[PDB]
């Protein structure tokens, strides 16, 4: 009952340079949005750095 479809990055089609395109499958009928939204909001601000 706690067994889901554990996913994986099937490919990293890094298009050209300083640009990647990472596809992850398979997730549940609803987990693509929650992982996309979680990673999108964290990368946007939380991720630190210098400028």
């Amino acid at each position: 009952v706690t067994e889901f479809l554990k996913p994986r990055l099937v490919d990293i089609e890094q298009v050209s340079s300083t640009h990647a395109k990472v596809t992850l499958e398979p997730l549940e009928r609803g987990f693509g949005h929650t992982l996309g939204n979680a990673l999108r909001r964290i990368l946007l601000s939380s991720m630190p750095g210098c400028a």
């Binding site: 979680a38 990673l39 964290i42 939380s46 991720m47």
Partner: peptide
Amino acid sequence: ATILAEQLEAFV
């Protein structure tokens, strides 16, 4: 993913 996993080690 490391940041989000370190923000959940007080639950699991």
